[PDB]
Each structure stands twice: as structure tokens, then as C-alpha cells.
Design a protein around this ligand. Sequence first.
Ligand SMILES: N#Cc1ncncc1CC(=O)N1CCC[C@H](C(N)=O)C1
Ligand SMILES: [Zn+2]
Length: 139
Amino acid sequence: SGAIYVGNYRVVNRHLATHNDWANLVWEDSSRDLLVSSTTAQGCDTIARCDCQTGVYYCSSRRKHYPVSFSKPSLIFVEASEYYPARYQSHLMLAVGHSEPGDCGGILRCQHGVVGIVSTGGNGLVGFADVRDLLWLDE
Ligand SMILES: N#Cc1ncncc1CC(=O)N1CCC[C@H](C(N)=O)C1
Ligand SMILES: [Zn+2]
């Protein structure tokens, strides 16, 4: 679990979105595993606007942060699930690091701010849904 709070927006993994997120829907993309909902309270997360390939992510299954090198956002394979059939997920970045079920939503940050959130895992790889291209989050 986990979310990004910027302005009047809440960014969450689409597969973990609540009834409240869907009733206050702003935008969602199944191919990215992202959903953004509106909030009453003001958020203060800073979104990174960069091409960093290094950062630190929070891993809830170890209660630890890990430094990682990660790939550029691209179209990449997942496996099926209560939530998706096998498919390419777009805007996904991989890193060698630890993840397993429940680690989705952990934030990945670089020196510029929030880069994305954990969205996939397995085989000693962790995948992050990028949010750096969503320029509208700031306005
Ligand atoms: N996190 C994690 C994890 N770590 C290890 N094994 C499996 C997983 C689970 C996983 O990858 N997914 C299940 C939920 C939906 C995800 C998606 N974006 O399509 C895929
Ligand atoms: Zn950066």
C-alpha cells in the first residue's frame, strides 16, 4: 500500500484504488496501473521533473529504504492477477531490488522529488510506475 499526495490530487496503484478514489476520479490508465483521485486536503509532495536513473525506494516487506539504479520508462511484461491479464505495462521502470506482494505503492524518490511508485515485483526485480511525465499534477 501507499500513495502520492500533490496539490488536490492523490496518486495510487490503479489495482489498489478504493470506492472513494473511483467516486472522485480525475484520471486512470490501466496500461500504467495508475489512478489519480481528487482530495479535499492540500498535498505537499514534490514531483521530480528529470531523467534520473538512480534513487531510493521504500520497501514495506523489509521496513527499509534501498538505493537503486532503474531503467527508463518503457513497455514491459507482467503476469496475470485478480487485477490484470498478461500484458505490457507502459511507463514502467525496472531495478534490481527486492519486492513481493503488498510492496506496491512504496515511493521511489531521487534528489528532485517523487519519481514513481512500486507497481510490480518478482524474480529479484522491482518495477516502478513513473509519474514524472504527468505535468498536470502540479497545476
Ligand atoms: N509488487 C509485487 C510483486 N512482487 C512479487 N511477486 C509478485 C508481485 C505482484 C505483482 O507484480 N503484480 C500483482 C498486482 C498487479 C501488478 C501489475 N502492475 O500488473 C503485478
Ligand atoms: Zn531526478
